[PDB]
mmCIF file of C-alpha atoms (C1' of nucleotides) in Angstrom:
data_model
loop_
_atom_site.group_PDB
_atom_site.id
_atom_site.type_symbol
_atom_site.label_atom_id
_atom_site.label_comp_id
_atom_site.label_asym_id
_atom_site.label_seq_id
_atom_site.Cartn_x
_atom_site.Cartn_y
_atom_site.Cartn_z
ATOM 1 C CA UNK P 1 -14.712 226.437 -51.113
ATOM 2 C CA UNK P 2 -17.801 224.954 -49.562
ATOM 3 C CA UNK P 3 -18.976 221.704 -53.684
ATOM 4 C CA UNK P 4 -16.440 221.720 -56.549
ATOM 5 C CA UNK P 5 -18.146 222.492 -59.550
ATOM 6 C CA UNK G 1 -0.947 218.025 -80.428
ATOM 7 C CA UNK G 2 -1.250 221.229 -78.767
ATOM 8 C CA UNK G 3 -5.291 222.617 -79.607
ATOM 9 C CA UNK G 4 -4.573 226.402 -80.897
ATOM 10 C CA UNK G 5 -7.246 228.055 -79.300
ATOM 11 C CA UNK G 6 -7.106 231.158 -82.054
ATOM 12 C CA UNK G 7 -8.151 228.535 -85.148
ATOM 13 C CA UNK G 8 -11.382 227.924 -85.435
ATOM 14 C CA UNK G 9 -11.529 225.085 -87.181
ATOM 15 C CA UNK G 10 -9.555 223.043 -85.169
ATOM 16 C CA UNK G 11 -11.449 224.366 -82.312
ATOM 17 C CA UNK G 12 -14.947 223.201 -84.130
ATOM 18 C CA UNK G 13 -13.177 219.792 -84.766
ATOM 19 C CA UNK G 14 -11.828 219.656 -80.762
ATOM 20 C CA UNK G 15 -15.322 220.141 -79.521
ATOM 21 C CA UNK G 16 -17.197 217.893 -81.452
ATOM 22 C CA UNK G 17 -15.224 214.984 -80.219
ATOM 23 C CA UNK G 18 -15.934 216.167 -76.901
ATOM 24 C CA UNK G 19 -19.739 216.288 -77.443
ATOM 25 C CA UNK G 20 -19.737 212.714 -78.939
ATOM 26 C CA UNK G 21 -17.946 210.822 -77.104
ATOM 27 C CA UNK G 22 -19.167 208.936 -74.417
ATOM 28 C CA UNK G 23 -16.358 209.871 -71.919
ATOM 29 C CA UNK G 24 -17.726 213.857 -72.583
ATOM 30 C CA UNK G 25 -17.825 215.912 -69.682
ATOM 31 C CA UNK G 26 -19.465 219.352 -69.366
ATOM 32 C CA UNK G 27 -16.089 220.306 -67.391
ATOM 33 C CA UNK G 28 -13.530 219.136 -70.150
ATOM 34 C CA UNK G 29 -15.600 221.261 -72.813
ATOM 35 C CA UNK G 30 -14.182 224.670 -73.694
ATOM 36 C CA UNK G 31 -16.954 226.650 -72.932
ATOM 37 C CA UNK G 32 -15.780 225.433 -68.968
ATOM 38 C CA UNK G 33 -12.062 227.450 -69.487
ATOM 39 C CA UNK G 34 -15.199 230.622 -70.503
ATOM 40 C CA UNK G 35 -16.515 229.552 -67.268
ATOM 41 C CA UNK G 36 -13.190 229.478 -65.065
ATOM 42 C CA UNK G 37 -12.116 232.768 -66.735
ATOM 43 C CA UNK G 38 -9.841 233.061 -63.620
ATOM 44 C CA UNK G 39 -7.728 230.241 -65.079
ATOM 45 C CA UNK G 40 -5.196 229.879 -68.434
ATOM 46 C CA UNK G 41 -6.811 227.131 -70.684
ATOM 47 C CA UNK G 42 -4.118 224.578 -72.351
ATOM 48 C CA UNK G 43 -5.845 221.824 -74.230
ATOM 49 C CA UNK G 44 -3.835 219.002 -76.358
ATOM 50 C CA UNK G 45 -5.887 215.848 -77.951
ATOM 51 C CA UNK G 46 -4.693 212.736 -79.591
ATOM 52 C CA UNK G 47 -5.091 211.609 -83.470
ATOM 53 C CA UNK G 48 -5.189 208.029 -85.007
ATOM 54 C CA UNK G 49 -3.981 207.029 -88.376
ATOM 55 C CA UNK G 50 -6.572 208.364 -89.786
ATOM 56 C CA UNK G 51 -6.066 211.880 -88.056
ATOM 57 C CA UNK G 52 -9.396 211.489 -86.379
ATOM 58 C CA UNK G 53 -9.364 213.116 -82.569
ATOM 59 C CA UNK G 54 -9.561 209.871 -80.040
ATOM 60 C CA UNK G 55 -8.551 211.080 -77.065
ATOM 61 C CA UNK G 56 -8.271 215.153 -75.818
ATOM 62 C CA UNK G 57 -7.304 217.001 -72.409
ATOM 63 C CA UNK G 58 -8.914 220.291 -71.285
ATOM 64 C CA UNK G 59 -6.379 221.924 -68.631
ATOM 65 C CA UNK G 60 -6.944 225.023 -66.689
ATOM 66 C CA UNK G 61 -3.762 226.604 -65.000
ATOM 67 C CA UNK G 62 -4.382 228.171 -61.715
ATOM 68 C CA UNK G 63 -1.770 230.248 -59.628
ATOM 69 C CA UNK G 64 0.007 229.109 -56.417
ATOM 70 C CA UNK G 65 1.807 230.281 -53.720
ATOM 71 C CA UNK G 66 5.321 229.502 -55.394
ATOM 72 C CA UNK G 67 7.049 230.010 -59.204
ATOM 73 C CA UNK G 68 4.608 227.313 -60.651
ATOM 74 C CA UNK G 69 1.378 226.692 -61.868
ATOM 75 C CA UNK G 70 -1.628 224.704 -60.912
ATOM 76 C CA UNK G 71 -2.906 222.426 -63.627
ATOM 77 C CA UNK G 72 -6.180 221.112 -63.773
ATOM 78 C CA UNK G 73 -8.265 218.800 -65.967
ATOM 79 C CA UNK G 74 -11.470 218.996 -64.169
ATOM 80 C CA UNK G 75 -13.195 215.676 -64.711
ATOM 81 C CA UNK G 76 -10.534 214.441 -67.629
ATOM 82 C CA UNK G 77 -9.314 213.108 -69.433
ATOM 83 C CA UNK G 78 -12.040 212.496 -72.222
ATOM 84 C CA UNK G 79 -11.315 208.882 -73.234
ATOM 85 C CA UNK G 80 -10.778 205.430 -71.563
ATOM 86 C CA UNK G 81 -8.835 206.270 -68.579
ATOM 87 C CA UNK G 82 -8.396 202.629 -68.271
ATOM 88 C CA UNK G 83 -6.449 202.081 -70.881
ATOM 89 C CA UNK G 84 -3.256 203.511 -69.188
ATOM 90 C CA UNK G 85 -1.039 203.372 -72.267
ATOM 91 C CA UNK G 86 -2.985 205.438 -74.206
ATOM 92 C CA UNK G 87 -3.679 207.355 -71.416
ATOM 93 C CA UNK G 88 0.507 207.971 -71.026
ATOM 94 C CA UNK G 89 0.396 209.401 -74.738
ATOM 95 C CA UNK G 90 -2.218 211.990 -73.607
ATOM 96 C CA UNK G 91 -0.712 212.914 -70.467
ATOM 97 C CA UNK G 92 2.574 212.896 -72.498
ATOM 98 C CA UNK G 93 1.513 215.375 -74.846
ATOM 99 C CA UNK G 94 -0.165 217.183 -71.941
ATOM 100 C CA UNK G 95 3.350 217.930 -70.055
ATOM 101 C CA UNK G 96 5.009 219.060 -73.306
ATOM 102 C CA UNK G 97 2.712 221.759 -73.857
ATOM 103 C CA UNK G 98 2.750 222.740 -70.260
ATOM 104 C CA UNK G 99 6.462 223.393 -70.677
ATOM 105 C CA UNK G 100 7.692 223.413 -66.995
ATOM 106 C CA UNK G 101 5.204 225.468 -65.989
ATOM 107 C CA UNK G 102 3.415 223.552 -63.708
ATOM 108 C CA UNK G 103 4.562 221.659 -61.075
ATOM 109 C CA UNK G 104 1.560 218.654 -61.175
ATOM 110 C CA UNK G 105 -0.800 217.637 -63.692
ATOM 111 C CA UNK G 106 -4.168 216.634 -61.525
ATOM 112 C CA UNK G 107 -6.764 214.836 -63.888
ATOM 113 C CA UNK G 108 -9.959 213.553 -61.692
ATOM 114 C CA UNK G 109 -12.185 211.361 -63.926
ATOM 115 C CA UNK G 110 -15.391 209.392 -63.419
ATOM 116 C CA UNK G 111 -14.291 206.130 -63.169
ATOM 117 C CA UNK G 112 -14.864 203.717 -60.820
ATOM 118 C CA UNK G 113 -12.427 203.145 -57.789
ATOM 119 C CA UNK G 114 -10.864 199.477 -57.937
ATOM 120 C CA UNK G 115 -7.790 197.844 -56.406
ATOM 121 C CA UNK G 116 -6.225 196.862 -59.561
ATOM 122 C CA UNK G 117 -6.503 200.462 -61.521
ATOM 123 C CA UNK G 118 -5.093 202.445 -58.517
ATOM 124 C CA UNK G 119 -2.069 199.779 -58.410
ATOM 125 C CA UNK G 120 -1.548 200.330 -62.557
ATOM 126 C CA UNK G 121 -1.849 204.140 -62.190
ATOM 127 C CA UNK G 122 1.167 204.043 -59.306
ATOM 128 C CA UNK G 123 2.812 201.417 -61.274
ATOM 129 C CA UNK G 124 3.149 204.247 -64.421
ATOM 130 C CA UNK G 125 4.484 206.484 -62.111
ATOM 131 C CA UNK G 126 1.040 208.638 -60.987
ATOM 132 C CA UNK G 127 0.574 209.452 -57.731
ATOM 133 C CA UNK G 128 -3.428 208.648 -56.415
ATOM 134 C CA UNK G 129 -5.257 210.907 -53.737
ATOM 135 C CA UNK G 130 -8.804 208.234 -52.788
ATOM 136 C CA UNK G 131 -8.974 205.967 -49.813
ATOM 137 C CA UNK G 132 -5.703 207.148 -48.642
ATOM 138 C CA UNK G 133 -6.971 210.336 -48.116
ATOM 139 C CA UNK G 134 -10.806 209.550 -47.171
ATOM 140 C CA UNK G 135 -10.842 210.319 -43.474
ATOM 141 C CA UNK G 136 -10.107 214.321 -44.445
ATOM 142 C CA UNK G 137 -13.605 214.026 -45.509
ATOM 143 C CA UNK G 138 -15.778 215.605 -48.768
ATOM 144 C CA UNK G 139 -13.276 218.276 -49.403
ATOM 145 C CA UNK G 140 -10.201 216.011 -49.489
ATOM 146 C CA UNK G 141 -10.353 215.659 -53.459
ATOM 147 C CA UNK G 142 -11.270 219.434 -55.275
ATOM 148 C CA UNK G 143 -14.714 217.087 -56.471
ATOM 149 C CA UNK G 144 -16.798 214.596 -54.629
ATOM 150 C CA UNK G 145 -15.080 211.082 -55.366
ATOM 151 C CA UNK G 146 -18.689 209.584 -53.791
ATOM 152 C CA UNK G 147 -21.302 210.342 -55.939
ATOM 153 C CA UNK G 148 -25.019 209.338 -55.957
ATOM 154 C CA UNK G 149 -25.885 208.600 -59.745
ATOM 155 C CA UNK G 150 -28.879 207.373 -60.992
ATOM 156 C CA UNK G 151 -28.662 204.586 -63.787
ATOM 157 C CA UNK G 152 -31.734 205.645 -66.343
ATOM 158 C CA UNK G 153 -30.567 202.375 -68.373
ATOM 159 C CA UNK G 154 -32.183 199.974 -65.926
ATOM 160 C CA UNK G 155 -35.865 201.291 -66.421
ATOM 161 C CA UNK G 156 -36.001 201.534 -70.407
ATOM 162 C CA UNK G 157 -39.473 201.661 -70.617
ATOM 163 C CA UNK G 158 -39.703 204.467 -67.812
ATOM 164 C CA UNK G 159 -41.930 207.099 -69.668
ATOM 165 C CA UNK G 160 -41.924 209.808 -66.423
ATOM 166 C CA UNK G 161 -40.091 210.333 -63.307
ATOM 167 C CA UNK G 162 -42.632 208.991 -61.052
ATOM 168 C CA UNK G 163 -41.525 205.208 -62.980
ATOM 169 C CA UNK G 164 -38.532 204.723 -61.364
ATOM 170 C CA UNK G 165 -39.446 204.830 -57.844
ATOM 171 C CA UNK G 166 -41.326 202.248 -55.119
ATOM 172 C CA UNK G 167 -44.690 203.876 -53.794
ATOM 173 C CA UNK G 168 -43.875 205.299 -50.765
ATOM 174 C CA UNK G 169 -41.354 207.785 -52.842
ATOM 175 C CA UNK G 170 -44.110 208.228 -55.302
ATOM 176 C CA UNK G 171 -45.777 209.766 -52.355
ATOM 177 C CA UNK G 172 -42.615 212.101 -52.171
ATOM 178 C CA UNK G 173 -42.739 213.077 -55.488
ATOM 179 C CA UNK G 174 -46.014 213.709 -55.577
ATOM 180 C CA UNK G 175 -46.387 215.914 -52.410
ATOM 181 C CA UNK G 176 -45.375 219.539 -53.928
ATOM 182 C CA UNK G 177 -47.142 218.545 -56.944
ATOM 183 C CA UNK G 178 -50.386 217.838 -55.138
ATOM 184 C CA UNK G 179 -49.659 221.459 -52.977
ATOM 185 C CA UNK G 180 -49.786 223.928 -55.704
ATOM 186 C CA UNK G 181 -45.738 223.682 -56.750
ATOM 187 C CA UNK G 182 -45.334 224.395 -60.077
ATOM 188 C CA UNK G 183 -41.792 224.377 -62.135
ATOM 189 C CA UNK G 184 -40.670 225.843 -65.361
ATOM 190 C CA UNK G 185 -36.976 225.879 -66.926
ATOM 191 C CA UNK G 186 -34.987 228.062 -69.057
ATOM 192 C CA UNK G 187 -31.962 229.709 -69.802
ATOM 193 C CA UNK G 188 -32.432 232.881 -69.187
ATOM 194 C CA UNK G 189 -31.275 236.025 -67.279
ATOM 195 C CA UNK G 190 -34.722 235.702 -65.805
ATOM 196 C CA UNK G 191 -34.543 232.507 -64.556
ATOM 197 C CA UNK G 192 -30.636 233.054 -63.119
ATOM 198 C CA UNK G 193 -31.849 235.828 -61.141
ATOM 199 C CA UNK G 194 -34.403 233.400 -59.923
ATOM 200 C CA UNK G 195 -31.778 231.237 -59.378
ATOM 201 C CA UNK G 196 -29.329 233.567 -57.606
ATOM 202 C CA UNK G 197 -32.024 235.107 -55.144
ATOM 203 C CA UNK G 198 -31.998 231.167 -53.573
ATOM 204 C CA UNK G 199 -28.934 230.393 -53.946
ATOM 205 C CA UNK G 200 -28.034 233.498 -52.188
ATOM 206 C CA UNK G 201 -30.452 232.703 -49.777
ATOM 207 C CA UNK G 202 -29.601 229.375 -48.813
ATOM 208 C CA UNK G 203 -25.597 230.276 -49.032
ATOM 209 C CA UNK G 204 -26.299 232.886 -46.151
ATOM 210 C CA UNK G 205 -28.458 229.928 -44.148
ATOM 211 C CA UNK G 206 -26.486 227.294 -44.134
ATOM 212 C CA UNK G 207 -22.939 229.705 -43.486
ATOM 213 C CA UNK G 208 -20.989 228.547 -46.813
ATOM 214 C CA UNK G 209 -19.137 230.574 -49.167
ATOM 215 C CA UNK G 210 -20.656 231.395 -52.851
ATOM 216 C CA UNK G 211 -20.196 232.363 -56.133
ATOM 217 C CA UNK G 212 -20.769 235.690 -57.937
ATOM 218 C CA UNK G 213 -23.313 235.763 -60.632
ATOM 219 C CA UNK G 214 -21.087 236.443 -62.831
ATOM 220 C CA UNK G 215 -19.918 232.698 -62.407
ATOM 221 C CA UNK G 216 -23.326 231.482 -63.597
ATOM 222 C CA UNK G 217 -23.856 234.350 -66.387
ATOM 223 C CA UNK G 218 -20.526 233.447 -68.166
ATOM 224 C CA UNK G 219 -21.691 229.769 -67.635
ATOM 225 C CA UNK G 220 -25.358 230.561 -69.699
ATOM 226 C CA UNK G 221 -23.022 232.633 -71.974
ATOM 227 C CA UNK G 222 -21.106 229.398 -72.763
ATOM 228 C CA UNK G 223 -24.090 227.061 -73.051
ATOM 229 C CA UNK G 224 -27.182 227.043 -75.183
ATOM 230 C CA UNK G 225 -30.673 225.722 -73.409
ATOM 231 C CA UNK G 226 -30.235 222.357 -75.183
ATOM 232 C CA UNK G 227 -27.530 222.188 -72.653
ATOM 233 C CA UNK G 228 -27.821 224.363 -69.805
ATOM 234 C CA UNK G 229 -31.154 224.532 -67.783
ATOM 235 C CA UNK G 230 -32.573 226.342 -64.673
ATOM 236 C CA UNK G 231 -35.063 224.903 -63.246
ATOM 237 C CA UNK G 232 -37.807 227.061 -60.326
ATOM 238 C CA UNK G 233 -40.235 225.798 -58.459
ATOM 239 C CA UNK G 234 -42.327 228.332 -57.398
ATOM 240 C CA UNK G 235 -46.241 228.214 -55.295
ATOM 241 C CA UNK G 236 -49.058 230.479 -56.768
ATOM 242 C CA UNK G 237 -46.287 233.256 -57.371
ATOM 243 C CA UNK G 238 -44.027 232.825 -54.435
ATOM 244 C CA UNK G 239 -40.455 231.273 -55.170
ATOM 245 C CA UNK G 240 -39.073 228.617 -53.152
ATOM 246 C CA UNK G 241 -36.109 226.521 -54.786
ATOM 247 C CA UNK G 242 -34.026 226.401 -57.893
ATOM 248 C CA UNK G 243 -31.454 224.017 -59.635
ATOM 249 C CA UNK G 244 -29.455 224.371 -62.627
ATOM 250 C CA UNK G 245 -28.816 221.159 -64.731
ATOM 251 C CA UNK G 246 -26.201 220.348 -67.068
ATOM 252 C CA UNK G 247 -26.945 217.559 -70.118
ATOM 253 C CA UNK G 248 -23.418 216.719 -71.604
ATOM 254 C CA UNK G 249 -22.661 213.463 -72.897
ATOM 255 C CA UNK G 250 -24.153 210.298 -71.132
ATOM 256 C CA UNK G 251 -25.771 212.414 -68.236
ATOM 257 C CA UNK G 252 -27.737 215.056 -66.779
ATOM 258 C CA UNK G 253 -25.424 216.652 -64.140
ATOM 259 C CA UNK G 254 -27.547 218.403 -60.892
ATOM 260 C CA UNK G 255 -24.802 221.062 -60.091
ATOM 261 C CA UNK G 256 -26.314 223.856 -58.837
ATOM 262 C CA UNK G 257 -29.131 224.203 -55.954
ATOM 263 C CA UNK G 258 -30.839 226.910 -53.515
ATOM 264 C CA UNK G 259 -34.062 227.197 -51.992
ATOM 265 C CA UNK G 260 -35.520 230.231 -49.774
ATOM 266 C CA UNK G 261 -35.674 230.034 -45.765
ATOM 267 C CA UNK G 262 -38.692 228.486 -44.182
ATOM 268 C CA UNK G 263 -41.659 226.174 -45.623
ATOM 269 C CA UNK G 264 -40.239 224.819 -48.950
ATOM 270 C CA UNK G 265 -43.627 222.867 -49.301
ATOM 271 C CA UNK G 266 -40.983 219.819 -50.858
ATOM 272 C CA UNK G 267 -40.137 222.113 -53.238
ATOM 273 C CA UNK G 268 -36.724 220.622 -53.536
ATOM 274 C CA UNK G 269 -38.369 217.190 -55.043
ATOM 275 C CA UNK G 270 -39.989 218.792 -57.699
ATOM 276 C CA UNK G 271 -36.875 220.328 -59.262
ATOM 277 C CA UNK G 272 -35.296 216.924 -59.103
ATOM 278 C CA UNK G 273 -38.597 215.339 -60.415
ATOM 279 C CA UNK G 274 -38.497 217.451 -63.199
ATOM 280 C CA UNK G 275 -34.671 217.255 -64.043
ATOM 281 C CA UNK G 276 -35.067 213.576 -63.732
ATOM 282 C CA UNK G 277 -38.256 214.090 -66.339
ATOM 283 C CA UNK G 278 -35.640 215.861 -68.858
ATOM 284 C CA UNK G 279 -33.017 213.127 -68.844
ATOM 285 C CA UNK G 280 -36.139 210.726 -69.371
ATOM 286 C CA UNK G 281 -37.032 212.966 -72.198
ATOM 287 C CA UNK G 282 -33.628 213.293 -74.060
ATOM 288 C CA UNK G 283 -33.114 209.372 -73.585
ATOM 289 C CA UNK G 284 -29.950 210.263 -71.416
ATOM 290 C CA UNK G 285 -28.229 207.547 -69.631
ATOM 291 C CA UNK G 286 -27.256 208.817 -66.245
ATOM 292 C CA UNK G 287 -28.537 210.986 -63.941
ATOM 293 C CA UNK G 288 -26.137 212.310 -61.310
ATOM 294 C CA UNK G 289 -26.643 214.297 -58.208
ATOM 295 C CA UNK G 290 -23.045 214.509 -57.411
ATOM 296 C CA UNK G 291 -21.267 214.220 -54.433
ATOM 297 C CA UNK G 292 -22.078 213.083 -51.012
ATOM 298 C CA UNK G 293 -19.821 213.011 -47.660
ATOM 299 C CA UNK G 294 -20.251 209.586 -46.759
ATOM 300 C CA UNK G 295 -22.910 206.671 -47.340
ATOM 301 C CA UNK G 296 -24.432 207.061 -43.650
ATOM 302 C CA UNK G 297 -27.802 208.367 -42.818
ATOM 303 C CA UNK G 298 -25.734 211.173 -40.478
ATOM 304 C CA UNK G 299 -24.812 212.855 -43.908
ATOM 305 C CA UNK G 300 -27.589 214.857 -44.681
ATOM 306 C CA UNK G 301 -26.402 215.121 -48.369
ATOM 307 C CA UNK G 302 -26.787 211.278 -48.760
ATOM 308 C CA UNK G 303 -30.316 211.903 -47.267
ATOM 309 C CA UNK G 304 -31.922 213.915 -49.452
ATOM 310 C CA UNK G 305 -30.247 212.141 -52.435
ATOM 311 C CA UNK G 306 -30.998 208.773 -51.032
ATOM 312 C CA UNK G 307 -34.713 209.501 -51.819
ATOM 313 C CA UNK G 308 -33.794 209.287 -55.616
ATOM 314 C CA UNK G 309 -30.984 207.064 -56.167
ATOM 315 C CA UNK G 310 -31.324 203.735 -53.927
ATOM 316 C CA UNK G 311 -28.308 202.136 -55.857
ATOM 317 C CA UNK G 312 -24.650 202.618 -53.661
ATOM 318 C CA UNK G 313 -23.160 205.901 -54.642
ATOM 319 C CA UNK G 314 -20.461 205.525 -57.022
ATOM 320 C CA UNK G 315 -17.273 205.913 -55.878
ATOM 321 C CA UNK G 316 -14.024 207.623 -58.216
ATOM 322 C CA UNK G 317 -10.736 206.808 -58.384
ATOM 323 C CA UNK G 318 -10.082 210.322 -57.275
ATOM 324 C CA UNK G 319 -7.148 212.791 -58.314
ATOM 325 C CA UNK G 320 -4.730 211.408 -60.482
ATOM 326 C CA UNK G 321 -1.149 213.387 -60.512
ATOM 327 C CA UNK G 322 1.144 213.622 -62.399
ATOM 328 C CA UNK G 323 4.041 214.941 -60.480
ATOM 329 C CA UNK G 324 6.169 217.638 -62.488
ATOM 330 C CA UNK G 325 7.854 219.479 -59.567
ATOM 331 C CA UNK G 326 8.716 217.147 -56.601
ATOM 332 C CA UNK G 327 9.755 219.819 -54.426
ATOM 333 C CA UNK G 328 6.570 222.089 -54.918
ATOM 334 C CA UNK G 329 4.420 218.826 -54.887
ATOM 335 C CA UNK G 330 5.660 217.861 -51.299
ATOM 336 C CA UNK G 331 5.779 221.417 -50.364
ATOM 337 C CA UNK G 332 1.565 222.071 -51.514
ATOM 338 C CA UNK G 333 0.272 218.083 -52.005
ATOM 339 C CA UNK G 334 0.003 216.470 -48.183
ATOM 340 C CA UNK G 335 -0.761 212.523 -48.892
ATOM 341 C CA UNK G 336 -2.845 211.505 -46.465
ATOM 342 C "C1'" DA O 1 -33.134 218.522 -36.991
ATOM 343 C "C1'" DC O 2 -33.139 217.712 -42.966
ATOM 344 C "C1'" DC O 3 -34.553 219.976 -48.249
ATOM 345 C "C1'" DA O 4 -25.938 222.379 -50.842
#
DNA sequence: ACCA
């Protein structure tokens, strides 16, 4: 959830 | 037509479109659906007269809270996204071999933001998620829509990394260089262990969630070194920072990074140094350090990645839906 | 304080 990827 | 994942020929004939054509992204490949092994794969392409592949689709199909699915084309569609009517044939084949099974169809692709394509897109019937949704921040979109890419086409005589750059960010570069850093690559379960010790490490530090290693082992799994690269940065034994790399049609993707607590000794420039040295090497076109919250020196991701792309960030037209299921869209989709 |  947090950088995409 | 519908890709039947069990046929290997078509498979063979899928994925060498994908590595060829200039719209390839390491994402829309179908070593990512390996990758995302969470996630049902549904992939559908497009034939000329001829029968040659000129446009595809990658989907993944995630689970939600309700009856329907999720599904995903990370980074797709792999063609001219501009070119909306062929782009309605795709998606067109896309929703017939999703067969009601999905509520939205969400394709994010790297194409530039402008007035005029987000007004076609709606026009067709898309819904867009971009500036109406910016002031949510980073995380509005799944991916970055900013994006700090360096253009490798504007220095064609460039022969290393150090070429690109005005003197005082030679100095930069040069600083863990000049202090003992040292970095070697591979693709290895040596080197991911390398990798996963800082990425651990600065997961923990900066209090952000992270992924298993088995995220990154099905990912080397997938992806031979040609493609797939760790690079470490270590000082006279000790490790300090990693980054994994991903070279896939017109760029070399940064996608991965950690670093251990304390003195780094710039650590963090050599790895990017000596990714940037690879795409110089392979003659790749872009070089792209991916996303960024905003273009302000308060955003300490556009700091660190202002020191190697002084160009504007890119910014993406953003998530692209195709809306399936109104009621489930309105009920998990807020607009902004 | 920054080096995702």
């Amino acid at each position: 959830a947090x950088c995409x990827x | 037509p519908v890709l039947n994942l069990n046929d290997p020929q078509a498979v063979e004939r899928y994925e060498e479109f994908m590595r060829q054509s200039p719209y390839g992204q390491v994402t829309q490949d179908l070593g990512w659906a390996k990758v995302k092994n969470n996630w049902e794969p549904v992939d559908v392409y497009l034939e000329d007269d001829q029968g040659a592949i000129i446009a595809a689709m990658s989907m993944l199909l995630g689970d939600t809270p309700t009856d329907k699915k999720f599904a995903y084309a990370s980074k797709g569609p792999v063609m001219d996204v501009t070119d909306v009517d062929l782009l309605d044939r795709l998606v067109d084949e896309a929703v017939k071999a999703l067969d009601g099974r999905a509520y939205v169809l969400r394709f994010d692709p790297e194409v530039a933001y402008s007035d005029e394509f987000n007004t076609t897109l709606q026009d067709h019937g898309y819904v867009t998620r971009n500036r109406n949704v910016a002031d949510a921040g980073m995380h509005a979109t799944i991916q970055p829509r900013l994006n700090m890419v360096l253009d490798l086409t504007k220095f064609p005589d460039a022969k290393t990394t150090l070429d690109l750059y005005p003197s005082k960010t030679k100095s930069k570069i040069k600083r863990p260089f000049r202090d003992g850093v040292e970095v070697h690559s591979g693709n290895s379960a040596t080197e991911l262990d390398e990798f996963f010790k800082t990425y651990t490490t600065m997961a923990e530090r900066h209090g952000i969630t992270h992924r298993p290693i088995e995220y990154f082992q099905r990912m080397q799994a997938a992806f031979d070194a040609d493609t797939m690269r760790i690079f470490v940065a270590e000082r006279e034994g000790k490790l300090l920072s990693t980054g994994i790399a991903l070279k896939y049609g017109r760029k070399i993707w940064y996608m991965y990074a950690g670093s251990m607590d304390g003195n780094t000794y710039y650590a963090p420039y050599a790895v990017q140094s000596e990714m940037i040295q690879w795409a110089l090497d392979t003659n790749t076109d872009l070089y792209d350090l991916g996303g960024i919250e905003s273009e302000s020196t308060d955003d300490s991701l556009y700091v660190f990645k202002h020191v190697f792309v002084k160009d504007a960030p890119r910014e993406y037209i953003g998530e692209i839906d195709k809306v399936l299921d109104p009621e489930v869209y309105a009920e998990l989709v807020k607009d902004g």
